[PDB]
Amino acid sequence: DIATLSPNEQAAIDAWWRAANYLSVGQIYLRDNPLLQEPLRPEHIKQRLLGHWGSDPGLSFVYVHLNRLIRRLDLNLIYVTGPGHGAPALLANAWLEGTYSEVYPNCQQSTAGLQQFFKQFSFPGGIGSHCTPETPGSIHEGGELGYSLSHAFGAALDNPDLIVACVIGDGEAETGPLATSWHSNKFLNPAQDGAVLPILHLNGYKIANPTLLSRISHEELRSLFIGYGYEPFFVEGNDPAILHGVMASTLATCVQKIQAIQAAARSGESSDRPMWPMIVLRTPKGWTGPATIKGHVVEGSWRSHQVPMADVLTNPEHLQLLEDWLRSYRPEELFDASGAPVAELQAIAPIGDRRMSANPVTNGGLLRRALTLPDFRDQAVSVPAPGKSRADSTRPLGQFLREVIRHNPDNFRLFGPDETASNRLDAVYEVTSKVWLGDRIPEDEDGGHLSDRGRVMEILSEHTLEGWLEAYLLTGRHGFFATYEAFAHVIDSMVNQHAKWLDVSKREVDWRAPVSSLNILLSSTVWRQDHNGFSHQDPGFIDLVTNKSARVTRIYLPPDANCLLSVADHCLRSTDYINVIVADKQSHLQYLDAEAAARHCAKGIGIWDWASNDQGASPDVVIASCGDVVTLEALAATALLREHFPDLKIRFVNVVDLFRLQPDTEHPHGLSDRDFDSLFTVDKPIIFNFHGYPWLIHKLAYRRHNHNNLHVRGYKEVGNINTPLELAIRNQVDRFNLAIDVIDRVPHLRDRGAHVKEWLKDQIHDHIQYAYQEGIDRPEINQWQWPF
Amino acid sequence: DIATLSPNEQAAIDAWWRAANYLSVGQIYLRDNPLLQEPLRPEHIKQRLLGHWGSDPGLSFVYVHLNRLIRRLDLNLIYVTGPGHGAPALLANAWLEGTYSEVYPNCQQSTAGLQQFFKQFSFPGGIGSHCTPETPGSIHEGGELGYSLSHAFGAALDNPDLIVACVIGDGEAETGPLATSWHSNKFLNPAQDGAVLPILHLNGYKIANPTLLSRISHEELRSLFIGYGYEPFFVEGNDPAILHGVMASTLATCVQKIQAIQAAARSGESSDRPMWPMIVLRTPKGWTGPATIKGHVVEGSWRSHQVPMADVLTNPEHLQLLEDWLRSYRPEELFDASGAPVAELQAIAPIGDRRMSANPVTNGGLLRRALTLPDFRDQAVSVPAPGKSRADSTRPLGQFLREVIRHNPDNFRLFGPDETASNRLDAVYEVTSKVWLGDRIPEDEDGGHLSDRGRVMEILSEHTLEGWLEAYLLTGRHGFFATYEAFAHVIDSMVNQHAKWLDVSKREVDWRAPVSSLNILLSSTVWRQDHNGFSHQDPGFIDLVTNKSARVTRIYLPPDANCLLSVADHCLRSTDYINVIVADKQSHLQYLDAEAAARHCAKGIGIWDWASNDQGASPDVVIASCGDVVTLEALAATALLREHFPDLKIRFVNVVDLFRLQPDTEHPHGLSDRDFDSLFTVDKPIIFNFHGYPWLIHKLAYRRHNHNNLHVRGYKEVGNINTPLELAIRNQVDRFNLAIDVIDRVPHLRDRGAHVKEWLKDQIHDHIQYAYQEGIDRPEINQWQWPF
Numbered sequence A, B: 001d002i003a004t005l006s007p008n009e010q011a012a013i014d015a016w017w018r019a020a021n022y023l024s025v026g027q028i029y030l031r032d033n034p035l036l037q038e039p040l041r042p043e044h045i046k047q048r049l050l051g052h053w054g055s056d057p058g059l060s061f062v063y064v065h066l067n068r069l070i071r072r073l074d075l076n077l078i079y080v081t082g083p084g085h086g087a088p089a090l091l092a093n094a095w096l097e098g099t100y101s102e103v104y105p106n107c108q109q110s111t112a113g114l115q116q117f118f119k120q121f122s123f124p125g126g127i128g129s130h131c132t133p134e135t136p137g138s139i140h141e142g143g144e145l146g147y148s149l150s151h152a153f154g155a156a157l158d159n160p161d162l163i164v165a166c167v168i169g170d171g172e173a174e175t176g177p178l179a180t181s182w183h184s185n186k187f188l189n190p191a192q193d194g195a196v197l198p199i200l201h202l203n204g205y206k207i208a209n210p211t212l213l214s215r216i217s218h219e220e221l222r223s224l225f226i227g228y229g230y231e232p233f234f235v236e237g238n239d240p241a242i243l244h245g246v247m248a249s250t251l252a253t254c255v256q257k258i259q260a261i262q263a264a265a266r267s268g269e270s271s272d273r274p275m276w277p278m279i280v281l282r283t284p285k286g287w288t289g290p291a292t293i294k295g296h297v298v299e300g301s302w303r304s305h306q307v308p309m310a311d312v313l314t315n316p317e318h319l320q321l322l323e324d325w326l327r328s329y330r331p332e333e334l335f336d337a338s339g340a341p342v343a344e345l346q347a348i349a350p351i352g353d354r355r356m357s358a359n360p361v362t363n364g365g366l367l368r369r370a371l372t373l374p375d376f377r378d379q380a381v382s383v384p385a386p387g388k389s390r391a392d393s394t395r396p397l398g399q400f401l402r403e404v405i406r407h408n409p410d411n412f413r414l415f416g417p418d419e420t421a422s423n424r425l426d427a428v429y430e431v432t433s434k435v436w437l438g439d440r441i442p443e444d445e446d447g448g449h450l451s452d453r454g455r456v457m458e459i460l461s462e463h464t465l466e467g468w469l470e471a472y473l474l475t476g477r478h479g480f481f482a483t484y485e486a487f488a489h490v491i492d493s494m495v496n497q498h499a500k501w502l503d504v505s506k507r508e509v510d511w512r513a514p515v516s517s518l519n520i521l522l523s524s525t526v527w528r529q530d531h532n533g534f535s536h537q538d539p540g541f542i543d544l545v546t547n548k549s550a551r552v553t554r555i556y557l558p559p560d561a562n563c564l565l566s567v568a569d570h571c572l573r574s575t576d577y578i579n580v581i582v583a584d585k586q587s588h589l590q591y592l593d594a595e596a597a598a599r600h601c602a603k604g605i606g607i608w609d610w611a612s613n614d615q616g617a618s619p620d621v622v623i624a625s626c627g628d629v630v631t632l633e634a635l636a637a638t639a640l641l642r643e644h645f646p647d648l649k650i651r652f653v654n655v656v657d658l659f660r661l662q663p664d665t666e667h668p669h670g671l672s673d674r675d676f677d678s679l680f681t682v683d684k685p686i687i688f689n690f691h692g693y694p695w696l697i698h699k700l701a702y703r704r705h706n707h708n709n710l711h712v713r714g715y716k717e718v719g720n721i722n723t724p725l726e727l728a729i730r731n732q733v734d735r736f737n738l739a740i741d742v743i744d745r746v747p748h749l750r751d752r753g754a755h756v757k758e759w760l761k762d763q764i765h766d767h768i769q770y771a772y773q774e775g776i777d778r779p780e781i782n783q784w785q786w787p788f
Ligand SMILES: Nc1ncnc2c1ncn2[C@@H]1O[C@H](COP(=O)(O)OP(=O)(O)NP(=O)(O)O)[C@@H](O)[C@H]1O
Pocket: A694, A695, A698, A699, A710, A711, A712, A713, B698, B699, B702
């Protein structure tokens, strides 16, 4: 009897459906007189109309039917909204269920509450027109389109009984990120994870153009969505009387198959990739609004996308049509005199946490358990002498991540775009593997590292991975993202969205608990250009992240492996941040042992006393580095200067936290003027060697008292192919150019260092000539060790 | 007989195939002794191996077969390479055809030429490992994956007889941009445009993971690629003896269907969307290389992706295997004593421009005709009084673009992501329409503006549009891209690729002629937030573009419609640039008439004399603006100051060319120190009101003599929903905050302007309170006109 729809139940569901639309339209238009007790007048209409209408009925249409199966089958559901402009529909149902009144006591279920509820939407000092963090039961802001689908899969991970109902607009489906995220079924495990129920809201139109997926034939539509691995179900029509029964049956069909798929997998009898059920819903745009306006068809057309009538404040004719639109919902039989929904509506409202707007998963910070972090000092490489030993920088991190996975079998995951092996993080493969539910071959047994139980997820689409991870954190869990720095620009749009979400959730919204940080590891830099990656890779992603704020993002550039461990350990505890860690996978020198590394990361920036020779004296120059390749060149330059200028006093400063450079006025995390003057003196030149565009340092530290003595060398440009030393020479960040820069800046070396400066230019000439002759650097360059 | 393959022809084709692989492997490994006349020794091997091997045989496999049909059917073809790391294969065939020797006389077809040809690849001072602009017959650098498919469609536009053979790697297909660009068949007109022949190189593996599209079943593969609208053809196997004949038949089948499709369409008998032929090629990775290395299978596995044996310089065992690998191609029977290919190879080499590496389309700048630009002064709005009249800013540009389309029916196009109507550029719809070959309905007749003959292209995927336009320019044609500024971050990766391509083509490569500029119009700004677009939209894309260089990118922020016309007219003539024009679609004031606008854009920056009152005197303050909304606030602030401080002298400067602010030392285009001191004085405060992040101005103009007096107000952050004046108040760019800033900075107003400053803060309080009360600004704010 679950598939069939009772006429009595059909009426109550239809009653809820209209009330949701009525509240949606009221939010768009009304600022006063919520229930049409008195004739509508221009003083009740909002001056500026920013809400969108063409998608609201469809979202409410599915939402009331989703609540039906929750009441019947006791399903645990989440609502993820593709078109974020359909916010009123979600809020209306949130208010109808009673969630919004509990979270916001001002917007009660009364006439006075409705007045505040209607006036707040898309209003200065109110709430936005998208699925902002202020929305109860919301994890995804659909303002930027293409990421709703991935967030459904991310939230589904390690939530076996959860089902995430994600509604997808046909216009959104034309975007690149969402077209590739359909293949996420191959990495979702039916045994341990939940289900995603994709609903294609094929209203037939974008803002102003038809959607191609609507204008592509039905046969090719089913062909496209079986090739994605889904079992597609089609509900088409325009008359709700038929469509209420038809779509209730389809949703009943889908849930049984989802449970049948999960039952088959968890029993172990069918350990294969299943054909997940997906719904294709073709309904008119602006479904229950005006039919035509000024002789142009509006409903079921792109003209209904935002607002069918935007001149209602101007001419009374449309104003009467607006009031006629509202009364078509028959609000007199939907709400009582007080302003609450009628008891028929309250009957079909789910109860407590079973409500999709009050599910604690959406407010994932309440479901967040801190990771049991093993002591990273067990994985710290031994550094008996600083800078005299070479070890692979990322392998200790791989071993540390292995022990985190061991102690957090479900709460933690790894995400990587087919680069985990290249990034040299294979230590995690010792305990787990990579997720794969596609076809398997015996050749995968040797080094494939493929299993459905794996805690590491791999796909070449960077958009898919970022959406997977962001949803995983917002549901109250932990993760780590590792990728090349060359392709970081691909996810720049997605990072902005998540940073937006975190910043609002901290300051504006008070009831949303903190979630875990977004930890990103840019594992291959632009200085050590390996085989893969384009020639002109740029560090520009770092500038984009620092563009957001110091109170939501953190940038770390640890110089060695122990410093990488402390940074990763520190950032696996921080909550409301986007942590971007820039480290290189090549074999590098090691500088700090576990104790010294931990103290260095706690400060974020500090003097290296072994690399300095200014103890108990005023340094003639401060050499600072931020990165690992540029740190090596800065250290090598320091060695060269000390050989040729024995009396020269050099203070070596290494900075790991980029944002420490900002003054404490901007953010509390930054250094004070006294602290900054202690590290970098008030009047001596600073030769800063930065892994990135040099102006980023100037943007951060422009207000310091010694900024006029700050001289930053960083990434400028590249050739087609360069050796590691030649590439540093092109950007003037190599050891020889840095030594020249120190000679130019130190006042008592311009006259005295002329002969050394000529010798340094000779070395640049010799190494370039050898580079063009052999294709690599000299052995003494590659095997350079810290002297002294 | 075209379908069947002669055994004599099969041998010569196989002879070409092995020689191409041999040259490819020689480029990867050898730096000396090209032909194995003497035993291989470590001094002949390259020190560092950066080339990739797993894709080279597949590219050469298709390439030799593509040349077959050129010789038979006289087809005009282009080779677009998906995996850019497969550069050696393209270069080897380029050398084999003789193109490379003609372009590069140093690399002759001899033994001495081969020594230079082998030693140059992936070498310092040589050439890169990707499809850089130095490659003959190359339009697309496949280093960043996901854009090869779109570039095929872009180059195909308005080239009816051209066929673009684009080879697509299975790993690349997992990326977001390429998954959505498959639907580009719906916008390609068989009647007027050429064909794209997509070849899916499904080698089964990525760098280190299996490709899901390979591990998805064959049935679901055909289902996926018929849903994209393609007729898929499958060639599978590993034995070339069978695969040579099978593949040749499939390519023969595809070309006939492509011609049959074009013949049916151009006769007019079948004006429907056709099922384009697409090839799915499943071959082992590292197809003709080592079978196993160190007990691990390499060929047909991810272990062959880059280099099967990377220790050949270390141990002689692999060194013998490398020489055994080379001799498996039997080079003795492929090259003569001199070093040229044998006459059998020369027989099957195409001739002249029919060679894909020597096709003049790829060097599109030779095929570039300058647009016949109508005088924009016909579309200039009348401005009898500056700043006293309001007109829609983008509509005159739409009319101007309409006349360009009229005079350039084939050489020009418009690209937009479902925003042309929103951007208010509908004037172009008066002469043309939008491309659409999907299903048509009678409802589209009213305002659909849909026709297959349209010169405007629409799709919600911004990745697809950018790839379409870049290829269109690189083939020697013109275009204009219009989109919102909110979603500009989506195409940031693609823009970097094209900027990279232009910069190399100007300085490094000498034989590549200039092509047309990339003209981008960010038509909706972040200050006038309309219905669509997320709340926290940022101008950060401007910072990303200025990141590249002043010698390849230009940023224009015209204040009014006449400045927009002059800027667009000026930028439709420039060749080797990425032109980004930031304009707003809202109804705005108009400031300059056609004559004054043209002079202003010629300077790029200049004093507005009507808005100034410092003529013949030293100005107390310089108020500068860069944008249109911020220009209005700067002008309104100027009016407020002149009302309350009649003696105050204000010079108003408007800047359209952002890069003029850079000193002439960086680039010739920038202003000199004398010119800059003329506009902005040497010692007076400058209140700069910028449409964007304020630091961008400081990055550009830090070297100026008066930079210490430069005070920039720009975009900082947003609330959820704000009125236009309230949003400007939040960022302190409104008229009242600017007037306060002038009071603070002018030395003789700190004491004297205290009472006005208190009044200004009262206005800020009053307008915010009104905004929270009504939801819009006061009528006098919305209808503000320039006084005086
Ligand atoms: N005040 C500044 N504001 C912003 N960027 C700056 C500033 N000063 C320098 N830069 C940037 O820093 C880089 C080099 O300048 P800088 O770090 O000062 O080293 P420098 O050797 O002193 N160069 P210069 O200041 O011109 O003598 C360039 O990319 C500049 O754009």
